[PDB]
Design a protein around this ligand. Structure first.
Ligand SMILES: NC(=O)c1ccc[n+]([C@@H]2O[C@H](COP(=O)([O-])OP(=O)(O)OC[C@H]3O[C@@H](n4cnc5c(N)ncnc54)[C@H](O)[C@@H]3O)[C@@H](O)[C@H]2O)c1
Ligand SMILES: NC(=O)c1ccc[n+]([C@@H]2O[C@H](COP(=O)([O-])OP(=O)(O)OC[C@H]3O[C@@H](n4cnc5c(N)ncnc54)[C@H](O)[C@@H]3O)[C@@H](O)[C@H]2O)c1
Ligand SMILES: *C[C@]1(O)CC[C@H](C(C)C)[C@H]2C=C(C(=O)O)COC(=O)[C@@H]21
Ligand SMILES: *C[C@]1(O)CC[C@H](C(C)C)[C@H]2C=C(C(=O)O)COC(=O)[C@@H]21
Ligand SMILES: [Zn+2]
Ligand SMILES: [Zn+2]
Ligand SMILES: [Zn+2]
Ligand SMILES: [Zn+2]
Ligand SMILES: [Zn+2]
Lengths: 336, 336, 334, 328
C-alpha cells in the first residue's frame, strides 16, 4: 500500500530545486534522489541553499557521505546525462519529476522506467503525455497512466480562472496574453537561438514576443473549451512572477461585480489554495513566493460591456507550479 | 528653415526636449523660443546634448549670449512661471507646444495667447481641448481651433491601426493592453503616489498594472468607435519602446493574411511614416528612435478565428509622439 | 520599559525602522508623521514591500490610528516639524528620517513639540554621529540631537575599526557600488544641483560623491583625514557593497586579515560585522541585519601593506536595525 | 586589407561592423558553425545594444553581402580545415572564446594564410594593446592576442600616469556590464559559482587578470597592479576604478593636464578625456579604449588617488582589433 510517495528529481534547476523545497515545506512527498550531470554534490548544496529569487533555504542542507542531506534527510545524487541509466529503483525513487526541459514526450520521459521508476511527472507541456492541472482536471488521473504532464506555468494560471468564468457565464471565445518573467532559456545579451530568433535577443533590454500553447492547452484540461482559446506571450525583464491577461466574450451577461463574486467564492471554496482573489493594489513582487496557481486581480481588469471583458491573474511561475507538481504527485499516490 | 512656422516650447522636460530634437532633425518647424523657469541655460545644454535612451544629439548645442543655439540656430530662453507672461510674440513664436503637463486644459493652455502666441498645441491628452492623431483625424483640424491636443503616445499607436482595421473589417468591440516602458512618473523604489498606489511601487522590481484612457480616447478621434474600445496597461522595467496588444472582434470576416495585406497597404500609402509594417523577428529595442506612431508586428499577432484576433503594434513612446507633434504643427501651418 | 518613539517621515527608512522596532521589540513606536502618506495609505505602504516582502504581522487602520501587531500609533500629517505634537503622543525619541532636517538646528524643531531626543537617520553637518559597535559608547545623556551616520559609513566603519585596531590604516580610498534609492530618477530628469543624479537610474552606472569614508574619521578619530572615497549607483533595488583599498601601517597576510575580521564578527562586533567565505552575491544579503559583512573570497591583496577589502550591506535593513539598536542603547543610559 | 573572422558572436560581429564602418580593413570570410547564413543577416543587422547596422546586409547565392561586398561563409566545426587560403583571408580573428592558446588557435594557417589575432587574453600568445605596446609588434609573431577589453581600458591610463608620476602600486576594480557568459536566472556555472547567479538580480564579484596583465604590456608595472570586478545589470559600458600610490607627487589638476594632453596627442582616439557630468550610457558606441572621467575621480593626497575611466567593452575593443590589423 502506498503512503507517502518517494520522489526522484531529474534536473535540479529552478523547478527541480523549488519542487524539492516545496516537498520539504509541505511534507506531502519524500525526495530521495536527484539527478543532474551539470551540478555535482557540493555545488547542489550551494545552489539549493542560496536563491536570488526566493531567499536562503529555511532549513539545513549539507553534503555528507556522498549524499545531499536536507533537514537531516539523505538524498542519493546521480550524475547521468542519459535518463535511461539513472538507477531510480536502487535509490527507492517511485515517482520521477522530469524537470530538465529536454525529455517531454512519453517516449523520452519513459526512459526513467528502465531504471526502476514507477511513474514520471513531466514538469512541462507534452506533445503526447496526458496533461493535468490541479483543481481543474486532476481527478481525471487514474493509475493506468505511468507518464503524465503537469502542463505549463501559464496553463496552471489560466485554466483555474477559465473554469470559473466558463462554469458561471460560458466562454464563447477568448484570447490570452501572458506578460512573463525571464527564464533560464533566455539570454543576458543578444545571442544564438536558431529555432526562435526573438528568444536569442538580450532579455534584460527587451520586451520579447513569444508563442505559447498554454491557452489552447486549456481546451485539453477543460474539453468544453477546446478550440475556444488561444494566445501569446511577452517576455519582460523581471526575475520572477508573471501575469495572465484574458480577453474573452461571455455567453451569459456578467456585471464585473458578478465576475468578482463568483471568483472570490471559488477561491474560498473548491479552488482554495489554487485560485486566489484580491482587491488590493498589488504589483508583481507582491506574489513572489506565493503558492497559488492563479490570483485574480479584481482592480486590474476591465469590462467593455456585460459580454466582453479583460481579466487579470497573477502567478509566481516558479513557486506556484513547483507546489502543484508536489500536490499532483501526492494525489497520484492516493490513487495507487 | 525657409517658410517654416516658428515655434515656442513651454517646458524642457523629456517631451519638450524630444519635440525640439524632432524639429531640428526633420526641419519641419523652426523652434525659436523655449520657456522653463526651473532649468537654467547651462543645464538645458546638458539635458539636450546627452540622452540615455536615444543617445547624444546628432548636431551642435551650446549656450551663447544667453540663448540656446542648436545646429547654429539661436533660441530665446524664457524663465516665466506664469504662462500668461511669456513674451512669445516678442520672440517670434507663432505656435506654442505646451509640454509641461500642468496646463492641459483649454483655460490654462490658452494663457500662451496672452503673450502673443497664435496657437497652442498641448503635447498630452486634454479634458476639453480637441484631440488629434496624425493620419486619423488631422484633416478635421481647422483655423478656428486655437488650442488643440495631440492626444497621447498610446492613442497615437492604437488609433492608426484601429482606423485600418475598422475601415476594412469593422471593429465591433476591442480591448487593449499596452505593455509600457517605464516613465518619469514612476519611482525607483517603493514610494508615495497618493492618487495611484501601484504607480508608487518600485519600477525596476515590478510589473505594474495601470489604468489608461488611451483606448477609450480612440473613440474621440474615430467617432464610429465611441464606446467600442477600452483597455489597461502593464508598466514593465524597460527604458523605452512600448507595445500595443489589441484584441478585437470584427464585423466582416478577415483571414489574418487579409489583415496583413491591408495594414501593409496603408503603411505604404496614406499612412506612410505613421503606420509601419514588419514581418521581421523584432523585439522592443529594434524600435528605439523609430519615428512611426505605430508599427504592426505581423508575426507576433494571432487569430482565434475569422472574427476575433489579437494584433500587436510597437511604438517608441518618446520619438514617435514627438515627431507627430511636429507633423501636426506642419499640417496646421499648411492651412494658413 | 522600552522607550517610546516617534518617526518623522514614513519612507524606506521610516517604514523599515518601524518594521525593525516591532520585529525586535527593542523600542515602542507610538507616533508617525508624514504629510504625504495618509493613514489608509500608510497601511498599504507598510504592509507590502517590493524589497523585503509582506509584513509578518498585522497592520490596519482603526479609530484613526495605525495599529501594528495590535499596538495603536498616533498619526500626524504636519509639514512643519516644529508643529508635531510628539509629547502629547508620548513620543520620547524622534527618528528624523525625512532627509531634509539633518542639521541640529532643523532637527531640533522636534524639541518644540515635546520630543526629548532626536536621532537623525542620516549624516549631519553638525550633529554628533554614532555607529553601533564603533563609537556608540561615546554617547552621553547631554546629547539631545544625534546622527546615526549613513548606510555606507555603517558598513565601512566597523571594518575600518578592525583593520586599524590590528594593523593600522595609513590611508584608504573607498568605492561603494550602491543600489538605487528614492532620490534617483526612473528616466533622465531634472537634478539641477547634481546633474549625473538626474540621469535614468535603470539604464546607467552613475558616479556620485559621498562623505561616507571621510565621516569614518569622525567616528574613529585616529582615521581623521586618512580616508575618502566615492560611489557608483547601479540598477539593483537594494544591497550595496564597500570596496576599501588601503595601505596598512603593519604588514598583514590576507589570511591574518581574515582571522581578525572573523574573530571580531564572532565576538565584540557580533551582529554588526559579519564574515563569510561563501560564494555570495548581493541578493544573498537581502534583509540581512548586519551593518557590514566581509567577503573574504572577493578581496585581494597586492602585498602585505596594500589590500582591497570587500564588505556587503543591506543599506535598508542593516541601517534601520542600527537606528533601533542605537535608541535602545540611548534609553539604557537615561 | 583582407581579413577573415572565426565566430560571429558579439566580438565577431562588432569587429565586422567596425571594419566596414572604418574601412581600415576588408572582411572576406566568416565561420561560426552554429548559425546559418540567413540567421547571420539578422544577427548582424539588428543589435539590441548598438542599434541597426548603418548600411545594408543581404544574402546573394551564398555570401554575406555587407554594403555591396561578398564575404563567403564556411560553417566548419574545427578550425584546422576551414580553407581560409582560397578565400583570400590574409588575417583571421579568433573571437570564439575558446582557441585562446597558441596551439589551439594555430589551426588557421593549416588551411589559411599569414597571421592570426586572438580577441581575448591568451595563456601564451604575445599580447598587445594599441597605444601602449603595439609599436613593438614584429613580423615574426603570427599568433598574437589583443588582451581584453579591461586591459585595453586600464593600460593607456596606467601608461600616462606611470610615465609622468610613477605608479608604486595600484589596485583596480572594474564595474562591468553583463556579458553573454552570465545567466538570466540562477543557473549552473560549475567552475565559477558566483557567475551562475541571476545577472538581472545581482551585483556579482568576479576575478579578473586584467590589471595583472597590464604588467605584461607595460613591463615596468609587472607585479605592481592587480584587481577584481563587480558585474552589474547594465547592458553595455563598463568603468575602471584605479586606486594607486604614486612615486612623484601629483596634484589632481596635474593628473588632469597630462591625461588631457595624452588624449589630444599620441593617444588620440585610444585614450579620451572628459570633464562633463557623464554616466555610462554616454559612452555607448564610443570607440575609445578608455575615457578618463575627470570629475568622477578623487585624491586623498598628492600620492594616493582614485582614477575613473569608462569603456564601451564591446565597441572600443572591436575597433582596436581592427586598428591592430591595420598596423599589421
Ligand atoms: N521556470 C519556470 O517558471 C517554469 C515553470 C513551469 C514549468 N517550467 C518547465 O520546467 C522545466 C525546467 O525549467 P527550469 O526553469 O527549471 O529550467 P532550468 O534550466 O533552471 O533547469 C533545468 C535543469 O536541468 C538540468 N539538466 C539539463 N540536462 C539534463 C540531463 N540530461 N539530465 C538531468 N538534468 C539535466 C540543468 O542542469 C538544469 O539544472 C522546463 O521544461 C520548463 O519549461 C518552468
Ligand atoms: N534608503 C537607504 O538605504 C538609507 C539608508 C540609510 C540612511 N538613509 C537616509 O535616511 C533618510 C531617509 O531615506 P529613505 O531612503 O527612507 O527616503 P524615502 O524618500 O523613502 O523616505 C522619505 C520619507 O519622508 C517623507 N517626508 C518628506 N518630507 C517630509 C516632511 N516635511 N515631514 C515628514 N515626512 C516627510 C516622504 O513622504 C517619504 O515617505 C535619508 O536622509 C537617507 O539618506 C537611507
Ligand atoms: C512557465 C514557462 O517555463 C515559462 C513561460 C512559457 C511561455 C508562457 C512563454 C511557459 C509555457 C510553455 C508552453 O506553452 O509550451 C512551456 O512550459 C512552461 O511552463 C513555460
Ligand atoms: C544610504 C544612502 O541613503 C544611500 C547611498 C549614499 C551614498 C553612498 C551614495 C549614502 C551616503 C551618504 C553620505 O555619507 O554622504 C548620505 O546618506 C546615506 O545614508 C546614503
Ligand atoms: Zn526566507
Ligand atoms: Zn496566494
Ligand atoms: Zn519605423
Ligand atoms: Zn502663413
Ligand atoms: Zn548577516
Amino acid at each position: 500500500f502506498m503512503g507517502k510517495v518517494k520522489v526522484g528529481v531529474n534536473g535540479f534547476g529552478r523547478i527541480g530545486r523549488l519542487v524539492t523545497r516545496a516537498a520539504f515545506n509541505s511534507g506531502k512527498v519524500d525526495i530521495v534522489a536527484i539527478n543532474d550531470p551539470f551540478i555535482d554534490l557540493n555545488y547542489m548544496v550551494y545552489m539549493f541553499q542560496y536563491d536570488s529569487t526566493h531567499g536562503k533555504f529555511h532549513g539545513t542542507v549539507k553534503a555528507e557521505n556522498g549524499k545531499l542531506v536536507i533537514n537531516g534527510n539523505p538524498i542519493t545524487i546521480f550524475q547521468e546525462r542519459d535518463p535511461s541509466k539513472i538507477k531510480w529503483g536502487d535509490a527507492g525513487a517511485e515517482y520521477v519529476v522530469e524537470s530538465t526541459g529536454v525529455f517531454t514526450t512519453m517516449e523520452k520521459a519513459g526512459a526513467h522506467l528502465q531504471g526502476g521508476a514507477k511513474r514520471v511527472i513531466i514538469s512541462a507541456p507534452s506533445a503526447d503525455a496526458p496533461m493535468f492541472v490541479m483543481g481543474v482536471n486532476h481527478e481525471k488521473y487514474d493509475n493506468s497512466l505511468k507518464i503524465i504532464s503537469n502542463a505549463s506555468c501559464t496553463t496552471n494560471c489560466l485554466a483555474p480562472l477559465a473554469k470559473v468564468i466558463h462554469d458561471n457565464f460560458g466562454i464563447v471565445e477568448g484570447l490570452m496574453t501572458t506578460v512573463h518573467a525571464i527564464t533560464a532559456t533566455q539570454k543576458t545579451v543578444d545571442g544564438p537561438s536558431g529555432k526562435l530568433w526573438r528568444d536569442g535577443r538580450g532579455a534584460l533590454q527587451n520586451i520579447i514576443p513569444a508563442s505559447t500553447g498554454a491557452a489552447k492547452a486549456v481546451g485539453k484540461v477543460i474539453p468544453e473549451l477546446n478550440g475556444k482559446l488561444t494566445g501569446m506571450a511577452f517576455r519582460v525583464p523581471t526575475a520572477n512572477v508573471s501575469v495572465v491577461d484574458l480577453t474573452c466574450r461571455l455567453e451569459k451577461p456578467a456585471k464585473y461585480d458578478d465576475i468578482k463574486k463568483v471568483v472570490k467564492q471559488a477561491s474560498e471554496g473548491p479552488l482554495k489554495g489554487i485560485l486566489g482573489y484580491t482587491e488590493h493594489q498589488v504589483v508583481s513582487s507582491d506574489f513572489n513566493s506565493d503558492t497559488h496557481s492563479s490570483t485574480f486581480d479584481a482592480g486590474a481588469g476591465i469590462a467593455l460591456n456585460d459580454h466582453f471583458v479583460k481579466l487579470i491573474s497573477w502567478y509566481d511561475n516558479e513557486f506556484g507550479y513547483s507546489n502543484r507538481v508536489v500536490d499532483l504527485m501526492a494525489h497520484m499516490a492516493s490513487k495507487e
